[PDB]
RNA sequence: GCCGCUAGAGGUGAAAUUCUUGGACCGGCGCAAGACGGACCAGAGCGAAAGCAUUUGCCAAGAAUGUUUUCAUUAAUCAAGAACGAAAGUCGGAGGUUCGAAGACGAUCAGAUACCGUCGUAGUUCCGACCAUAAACGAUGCCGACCGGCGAUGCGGCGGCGUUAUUCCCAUGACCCGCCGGGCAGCUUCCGGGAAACCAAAGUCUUUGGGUUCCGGGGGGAGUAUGGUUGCAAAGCUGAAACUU
């Protein structure tokens, strides 16, 4: 778990600093699956861009579908401008590769 | 119990017991033949063998000695004789 | 008043952390043979990693030794690492065996390290039994994998990447993934890093070590 | 008069358990005749945690706990009321006592 | 009397007796 | 403390086993009942007996009392269920397949009113 | 936020409240439980550690030391390893009397079963 | 040993003996010394019993299981005899950090030459040579047979839905439900026993014999006296009467 949802970025940016990418992704899944972080904050979009970024280069297709289902449960509030933005940025990074 | 027949035991309770504790003791090993898949020697192995049984075509090992049954090398074919 | 002759120096962290200014130290001023900048060359600080970065991870404490002072700035270099006492005593419970190993691995910059590890055996989620113990060959070859990873993933690196590994503990996750065919482990930490011998101090390596 | 069948020990099937020393009187008891007790509390008390919390520079810092492993001899438990004397027929109750309601 | 100290006192008595008997 | 002792709540119950056709719910009737039906010495015992038979008749007509006899059931055979369709008349009975092997080897199961359901995966029935 | 480090050696006989700088060498103030009471029976009181905490707070306020880390410590070694009664009154009083409080850690020294203890085999009776 | 602060430290029910302006206690970085192996550590393991715990080696040794391997009664218990046997103890040498008999002081008490504090010799520690006693305890000799159940636990073997490795359906391990053997123990039972406590043996015993070794005969005297032998010594083993109740 985390004590504060911004800390997911501070952990995942340290795992990419050495260059391991599998603990970097699965921390960022395990912050979203926690039960205290489904109420919308501003930091939940830029970790979800990063978790969709990290699913691309490891080419894990099963894992990105689950978190984009989970974030779709989270933003049932009126900011689907986030849910538009997280989806096409995944669909930008997939075409570039 | 206490009317129980000792002269006609059922085979569920005759494969249950230890091999010395039956009416007639009978061993729990059996004789196999191992077929190696790239040669034509049918080769006769024990179930519980203790040496590495060497075949004579392509000189491979068929079985590995372990504390129980010998684990045959994976991808050969066996059947029990008799 | 013996506190009138004390100037307040500043202490600068190495470059691997986000936050550099970690606090303020004191020295009596130069009145004789006692020079200030030799009077502090041996200060060692126990600084936590939720102070060197603004993360929540509080249990992993760093030792940082002042080697040279430039201006009023104390320049530090890395001296060791510890877990705190309540984290390391929070993890020893009954009904699990504990696998601990130590290696002395020499880095590529002349620095010698000694790395201590810890690991416990994880009980399963569909398990019934109370006790989860390993046999002795399982503890021996999990300890063999532990010493092998902790000399191989520190052996051909410089010091800055070693402290970069030690902040998230990539070594603990690597040990826990590699050791799961023998017995599934539970939280695996590099507990304590000692710095046994250091090479000659020259200012260019520390002045590039700050950035 | 045999009083206890296990003789108040955990020594079944070995010759010697190495002794530990009591924390309260330093009386050398064996490892398993001693009454082990593991006392976990917070480091700050329940009273002073209400005004520690206004002084912390860190937002949302959960304070650590104190992990004390206590061994006790058999004399100083009945002096210290950790363990008290029970009936002849409820000595066969070796379920630990309830801490929950 | 605790029987170890009865034993010890007859031990001291026999040690003094064998002291007094081998002088001659 | 106003607890009634053994005589004023045993004697009141042996007064209630017989003579139930005379007793009622009002205290002043039963107080006047108690001298035809008994020989009681002086009235404070008789008022205490009357108070307990009024409290017991306050209790007794909405269910069974432990101490009272099946003279209560003589009242429930004097004053007082199935459904229309029985709860054993259900039309699909789920059967896990070991029962179906038992019924096949009892010479039933040619007749089908049952429906066999899928077997469980996992054997975790114990407690840790 | 000039940090110092408070060192609380809480004995059963005494109470050492020691405020130092971040490494620990340059001592800013040291007050013991023996400085504020006239009696050996009450050196380890809550009251002696309360008064010692107030004096070390007044000393470290005037030097710039605004905030404090805690190193809480028992007698340790082969002796008892609970910090005694004078830890809590010092640590409550520092947070009451105008200081700020950092991370609290238990620094009681624990052996790998070190050498024999002061009582006999048969106890302290 | 070097710092850098300061008037008390220690210890107790309360204190005093002890240490401290030649700088103690506490804090910091260091060096060395010797002991010790916490938490993990359980009615769990191994050993003939005494006992045995940091890592990695090397050296031999062993129970258990598996066995359609071989020998063919080789076996069970043990007069004489021998091997090991905690701690204390004795002698020769090396080592000595802490504890600590004797001892010197303090204080509790009428008195304490006891518990309670300060310090300490011999010893505790290691390498050789002795001594062979313990509530060395399951206060229960050893081998074999037979006689109810139950659920786990340690090891080895066999068979069964599944679930997990990840990095190749992936290898082999970790769990799940059973079975067999051996082992440490458990809860229950009007098997049965026992004087009872209790015991699945301390059962199958007046319905009395599977084999075999040491040993007890009311309480003291006394494990004393003497005699013998073992030991540098302390002592060990064998070891009675008279008398008394
Ligand atoms: Zn005690």
UniProtKB/TrEMBL annotation, chain G:
- Supply the alphabetized keyword list: Ribonucleoprotein, Ribosomal protein
One GO cellular component term: cytosolic small ribosomal subunit
One GO biological process term is:
translation
State if Nuclease is listed as a keyword: no
Annotated GO MF terms: structural constituent of ribosome
Record region (Disordered): 106-125
Keyword tRNA-binding, does the record have it? no
* Highest taxon above the source species: Eukaryota
**Which family, according to UniProt?**
Belongs to the universal ribosomal protein uS11 family.
What does this chain do?
Component of the small ribosomal subunit. The ribosome is a large ribonucleoprotein complex responsible for the synthesis of proteins in the cell. Part of the small subunit (SSU) processome, first precursor of the small eukaryotic ribosomal subunit. During the assembly of the SSU processome in the nucleolus, many ribosome biogenesis factors, an RNA chaperone and ribosomal proteins associate with the nascent pre-rRNA and work in concert to generate RNA folding, modifications, rearrangements and cleavage as well as targeted degradation of pre-ribosomal RNA by the RNA exosome.
What does the annotation say about its assembly with partners? Component of the small ribosomal subunit. Part of the small subunit (SSU) processome, composed of more than 70 proteins and the RNA chaperone small nucleolar RNA (snoRNA) U3.
What is the protein's given name? Small ribosomal subunit protein uS11
Q: Which organism is it from?
A: Homo sapiens
Q: Give the taxonomic lineage as stored in the record.
A: Eukaryota, Metazoa, Chordata, Craniata, Vertebrata
Q: Which residues of the full protein are shown?
A: 26 to 150 of 150
């Amino acid at each position: 778990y985390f004590q504060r949802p911004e800390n997911a970025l501070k952990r995942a940016n340290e795992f990419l600093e050495v260059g391991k990418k599998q603990p970097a992704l699965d921390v960022l899944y395990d912050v979203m699956k926690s039960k205290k972080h489904r109420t919308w904050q501003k930091i939940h979009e830029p970790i979800m861009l990063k978790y969709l970024e990290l699913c691309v280069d490891l080419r894990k297709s099963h894992l990105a579908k689950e978190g984009l289902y989970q974030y779709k449960n989270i933003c049932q509030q009126v900011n689907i401008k986030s849910l538009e933005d997280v989806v096409r940025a995944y669909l930008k990074m997939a075409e570039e590769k | 119990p206490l009317a129980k027949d000792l002269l006609h035991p059922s085979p569920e309770e005759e494969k249950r017991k230890h091999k010395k504790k039956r009416l007639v003791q009978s061993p729990n090993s059996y004789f196999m033949d191992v077929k190696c898949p790239g040669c034509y020697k049918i080769t006769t192995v024990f179930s519980h063998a203790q040496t590495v049984v060497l075949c004579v075509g392509c000189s491979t090992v068929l079985c590995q000695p372990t504390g129980g049954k010998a684990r045959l090398t994976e991808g050969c074919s066996f059947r029990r004789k008799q | 008043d013996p506190f009138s002759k004390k100037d307040w120096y500043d202490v600068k962290a190495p470059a691997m952390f986000n936050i550099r200014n970690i606090g303020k130290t004191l020295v009596t001023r130069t009145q004789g043979t006692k020079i200030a900048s030799d009077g502090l060359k041996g200060r060692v600080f126990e600084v936590s990693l939720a102070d060197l970065q603004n993360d929540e991870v509080a249990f992993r404490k760093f030792k940082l030794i002042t080697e040279d002072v430039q201006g009023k700035n104390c320049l530090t270099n890395f001296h060791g690492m510890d877990l705190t006492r309540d984290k390391m005593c929070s993890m020893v419970k009954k009904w699990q065996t504990m696998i601990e190993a130590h290696v002395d691995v020499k880095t590529t910059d002349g620095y010698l390290l000694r790395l201590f590890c810890v690991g416990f055996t994880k009980k399963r989620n569909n398990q019934i039994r109370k006790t989860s113990y390993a046999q002795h060959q399982q503890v021996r070859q999990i300890r063999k994998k532990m010493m092998e990873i902790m000399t191989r993933e520190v052996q051909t690196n410089d010091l800055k990447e070693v402290v970069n590994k030690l902040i998230p503990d990539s070594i603990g996750k690597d040990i826990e993934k590699a050791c799961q065919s023998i017995y599934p482990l539970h939280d695996v930490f590099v507990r304590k890093v000692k710095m046994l011998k250091k090479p000659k101090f020259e200012l260019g390596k520390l002045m590039e070590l700050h950035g | 008069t045999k009083k206890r069948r296990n003789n108040g020990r955990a020594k079944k099937g070995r010759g010697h358990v190495q002794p530990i020393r009591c924390t309260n009187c330093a009386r050398c008891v064996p490892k398993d005749k001693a009454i082990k007790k593991f006392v976990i509390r917070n480091i700050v008390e329940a009273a002073a945690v209400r005004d520690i919390s206004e002084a912390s520079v860190f937002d949302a810092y959960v304070l650590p706990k104190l992990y004390v492993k206590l061994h006790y001899c058999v004399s100083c438990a009945i002096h210290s009321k950790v363990v008290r004397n029970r009936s002849r027929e409820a000595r066969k109750d070796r379920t630990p006592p309830p801490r929950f309601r | 009397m605790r029987a170890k100290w009865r034993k010890k006192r007859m031990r001291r008595l026999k040690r003094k007796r064998r002291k007094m008997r081998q002088r001659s | 403390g106003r607890v009634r002792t053994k005589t004023v709540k045993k004697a009141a119950r042996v007064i209630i086993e017989k003579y139930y056709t005379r007793l009622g719910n009002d205290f002043h009737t039963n107080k006047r009942v108690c001298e035809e039906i008994a020989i009681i010495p002086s009235k404070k015992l008789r008022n205490k007996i009357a108070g307990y038979v009024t409290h017991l008749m306050k209790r007794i007509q909405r269910g069974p009392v432990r101490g009272i006899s099946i003279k209560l059931q003589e009242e429930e055979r004097e004053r007082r269920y199935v459904p229309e369709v029985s709860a054993l008349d259900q039309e699909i009975i789920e059967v896990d397949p070991d029962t179906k092997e038992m019924l096949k080897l009892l010479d039933f199961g040619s007749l089908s009113n049952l429906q066999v359901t899928q077997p469980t995966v996992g054997m975790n029935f114990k407690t840790p | 936020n000039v940090f110092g480090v408070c060192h609380i050696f809480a004995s059963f006989n005494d109470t050492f409240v020691h405020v130092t700088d971040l490494s620990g060498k340059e001592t800013i103030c040291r007050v013991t439980g023996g400085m504020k009471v006239k009696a050996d029976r009450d050196e380890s009181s809550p009251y002696a550690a309360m008064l010692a905490a107030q004096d070390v707070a007044q000393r470290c306020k005037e030097l710039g030391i605004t905030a404090l880390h805690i190193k809480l410590r028992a007698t340790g070694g082969n002796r008892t390893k609970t910090p005694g009664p004078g830890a809590q009154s010092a640590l409550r009083a520092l947070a009451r009397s105008g200081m700020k409080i950092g991370r609290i850690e238990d620094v009681t020294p624990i052996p790998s079963d070190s050498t024999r203890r002061k009582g006999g085999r048969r106890g302290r009776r």
